[PDB]
Amino acid sequence: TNRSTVKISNVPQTIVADELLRFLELHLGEDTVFALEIPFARVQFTTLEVKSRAQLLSSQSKLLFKTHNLRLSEAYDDIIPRPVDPRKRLDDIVLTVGFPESDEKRFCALEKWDGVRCWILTEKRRVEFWVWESGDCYKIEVRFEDIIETLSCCVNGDASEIDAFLLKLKYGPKVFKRVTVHIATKFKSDRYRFCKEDFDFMWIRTTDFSGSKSIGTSTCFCLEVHNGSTMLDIFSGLPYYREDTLSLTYVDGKTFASAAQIVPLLNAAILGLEFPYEILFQLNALVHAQKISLFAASDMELIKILRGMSLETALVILKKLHQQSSICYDPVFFVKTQMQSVVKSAYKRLTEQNIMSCQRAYVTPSKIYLLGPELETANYVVKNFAEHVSDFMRVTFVEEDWSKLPANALSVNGFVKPSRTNIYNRVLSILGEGITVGPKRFEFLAFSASQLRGNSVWMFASNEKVKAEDIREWMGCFRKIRSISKCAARMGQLFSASRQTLIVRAQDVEQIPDIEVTTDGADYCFSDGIGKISLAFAKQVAQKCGLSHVPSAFQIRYGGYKGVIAVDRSSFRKLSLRDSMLKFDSNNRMLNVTRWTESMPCFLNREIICLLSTLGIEDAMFEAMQAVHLSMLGNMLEDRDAALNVLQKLSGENSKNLLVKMLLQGYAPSSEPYLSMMLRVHHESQLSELKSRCRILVPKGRILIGCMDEMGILEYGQVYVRVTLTKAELKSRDQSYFRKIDEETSVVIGKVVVTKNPCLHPGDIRVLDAIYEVHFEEKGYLDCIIFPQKGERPHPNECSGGDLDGDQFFVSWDEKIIPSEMDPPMDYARLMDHDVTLEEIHKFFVDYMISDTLGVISTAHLVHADRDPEKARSQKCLELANLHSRAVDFAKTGAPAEMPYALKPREFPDFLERFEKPTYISESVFGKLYRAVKSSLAQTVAYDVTLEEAGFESFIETAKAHRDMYGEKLTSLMIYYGAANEEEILTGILDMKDRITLSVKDLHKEAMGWFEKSCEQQKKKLASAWYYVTYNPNHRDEKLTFLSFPWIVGDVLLDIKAENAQRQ
Ligand SMILES: [Mg+2]
């Protein structure tokens, strides 16, 4: 319960471990100390009886070495994780990994290991098995969440009822390797040495040590323990322990041994002509999800039954097999039952609805996890190659728990050289040789920047029609690119979502030169990515995007000139691009607009709050703004303000949202059940965000796309910010921070704080001056901060490392957070002849995994910023800001940003919900916001529908089938991914693709709803909407529990409600 690791009190640095080893011998029992640490010293004892006796002697205060007293304090983190309970440390056991081969009582002994040291750790929730395969030692650790079922087994004779203990895993263990340095053993106390049993060496994560790779291809661990008197262990401490002991007999698992370093959990080549894109992937998906066993899919019966039957029914039956949460030990029986009890548009929907059925694969450190076809937003590559959409595969590299791969897993990081571990080599080998799910071999083609951040890789099966290399030829990569950075940029440019604007003539594209100052040594270009566009081209681009207004600037990727282009009414050339926007060469002379300039609501971040506090904004100022935010959030369940205060701006909802529709012209949020539940979900999301990432909205502030003034009027330290006034801002206008330009928009006149999204170094917070230019009408910039054309240094450049390639700048006129003084900024300062190879791109991906994520670097900066007197100007914080800049620049220079141990957060703020880390209270630097958030958190309508929304007699009742079909589809989606009882598009938002899986059934319902409507439409569309409302609300006692079927036609329902209210 304490791990016997006692944090020693103040001790001198001139202390010998052998001295304390022998001194403790004269004070406690003989050889009764396990481990010892001296840098805040730690001593681990053998048991909890020898511990609490030193504490008893510590309370007696007798122990005093030399002239220094010892105050043995509370138990800190374990020096070496060992089970203090003598019984929990099981040694010399027989461990066999396998799967139940679809019988629930027979086990595939894939590989048997003898001498396994099973350490069942409760405080640190993990059971670590120490194996000794070959000549090296490996540790197999389950995580107490891997175990979905622990069973009491009887593998040998029935004389002993309890002989083995099964450990059914759902994610798969993390395998480590015993690697030593053979260095001097003393090192005073040393970190892992001084142990009684010589627990030296390091534990680096590696792959399946078994030649047969039995660890990966096994979903269960069997622990043949010598004694069955261990009921107390392997009990409710191990999750899901049934008391019903099962008789388990071993079977030969030699037929499932695969030596392939890729995809160790797939079916063998025992298929004649079976289609792998629709069964083998789905069968392997079932095996990985453990819905059926590996022998359940490799058996002749199921293979022959699926081969004989139709493919569409096969997809349906395999999906239904994947539906149930238990392990189907009789997939043949399930398939036969669904066959006998069968109860009897087009795949190219991405060309129209921009949604693909992608077959993603999470490649863990030692296992493959195929996840079948899943609906996500389509990208340009599949948009072009929809003929082979089933040949794509979104390969993601995870850490055996569907979590992000740690840098420690892929790199060792007391070491002389950063030697990459076996996980990095495995990822490189998989990216090279590809994933082979049967006949289809998925080999790497390219990845996106977000995919790089998400550790996701696309792989194409080399179909006979088009090879996986020809698509790379289409995308323009690996053709003539010379640098890995620009190769990755070109690869990612064709994956990010965008809108295809008008095709632009190459002759109409002017090339206006860049603006560079080149002062103070650094070469700084003012027009780093900002271009131009004519007003006519702007209007046609706007209507191409889908807007009725002309945005000030568009973030574009036209050809290779990636950047943002502003609307100049003086400009007559169509596109007037620049050289500084060039990233790669491309003949695709057509605009690809990602996002335009809109007045996106502002919201602070923990990094922005940290820097503003460091520059001199008191914590009592942020707390007041968060108090206003929490006041706005508390009454959203009880006031109509949520229509234009929470959903409109705090969340991603807009004027076309259904909740906004029924709140702008509807009743209170708590009146309607669907409205109340969706508003409660939004409330939970906003509170969780504000508690995690302090998105404190500033009404006097807007996050705006950076832009440059194309005329020389704006000077250094001066910016132009003309923003369309919000409704609340329209109500309270004509202030010192604004002046009326039009009936709708106003330009800031006062001081403005400007910083980029990362915003980690004190100095990116720039207190610029918002000035009104007499040329506001001539150029008409809107919802975009206008950086000066000339000056000592470009303002986005001194905003950390920002530039006008579409980077959004945090701009707020709110005087409360505007610093009195601004810190002077950081400096923010190779075409190898070997060209770009596929292996080089794989190495770039691997090294990006080596580099620590921007999120963890920002979190560590927060940790080191919440205690130091200089919050962000601290040496730790400045060095880690430089490291964060290196991590951002990794997309340009492939040097991983390995955060050192000195910069690692030893103890984490209470604001960050890091339960594994040792938390310290953070009442110093705006940690009061978390406490305020917690304090704020811890402070049918059928008749109404039939009256004010269903006045016209519908009497259709055709929506009952939809409620039994679309409701069935929603229940299927909830069973597949969801966990709550929500039936709306936010079902998975408790979410990356749940809004895509959902809102498609509603889109299917919308198609189904109009299909059942014969159109006028008052007798068809309104009738169907009223029938759905009556089916859901009036018969809510039925077995539907949806409350969202009428919301699929919710626009029509709200229109009918307004029409009935208009007639009244
Ligand atoms: Mg940028």
Author numbering: 7 to 45, 56 to 360, 368 to 436, 440, 442 to 856, 861 to 970, 980 to 1030, 1046 to 1070, ...
Give me lines lifted from the publication on this model.
pmcRNA-dependent RNA polymerases (RDRs) are encoded within the genomes of many eukaryotes and function in gene silencing by converting single-stranded RNAs (ssRNAs) into double-stranded (ds) precursors of short-interfering RNAs (siRNAs). In plants, transcriptional silencing via siRNA-directed DNA methylation requires RNA-DEPENDENT RNA POLYMERASE 2 (RDR2), which associates with DNA-dependent NUCLEAR RNA POLYMERASE IV (Pol IV) via direct physical interactions that bring their active sites into proximity. The coupled transcription reactions of the Pol IV–RDR2 complex yield short dsRNAs of ∼30 bp that are then diced into 24- or 23-nt siRNAs by DICER-LIKE3 (DCL3). We report the structure of RDR2 and experimental evidence for how RDR2 engages its RNA templates and initiates transcription.
The higher-resolution RELION map was then used for model building, employing Buccaneer and manual steps. The N-terminal region (amino acids 1 to 360) of RDR2 begins with an N-terminal domain (amino acids 1 to 100) that includes an RRM followed by a β-barrel–like domain and a four-helical bundle domain. Following the N-terminal region is an active site cleft composed of multiple domains termed slab, DPBB1, connector helices neck 1 and neck 2, DPBB2, bridge helix, trigger loop, connector helix neck 3, and head, respectively. The three highly conserved aspartates (Asp triad) required for phosphodiester bond catalysis are located within a loop of DPBB2. Extra density at the position of the three Asp residues is seen in the RDR2 EM map, likely corresponding to a Metal A Mg2+ ion. No Metal B density is observed in the RDR2 structure, but this is expected given that the RDR2 particles imaged by cryo-EM were not engaged in transcription. Examination of the electrostatic surface potential shows a positively charged surface, starting with the RDR2-RRM and continuing along the cleft and into the active site. However, an intriguing difference between the enzymes is that RDR2 behaves as a monomer during purification and upon imaging by cryo-EM, whereas the QDE-1 proteins were crystalized as homodimers.
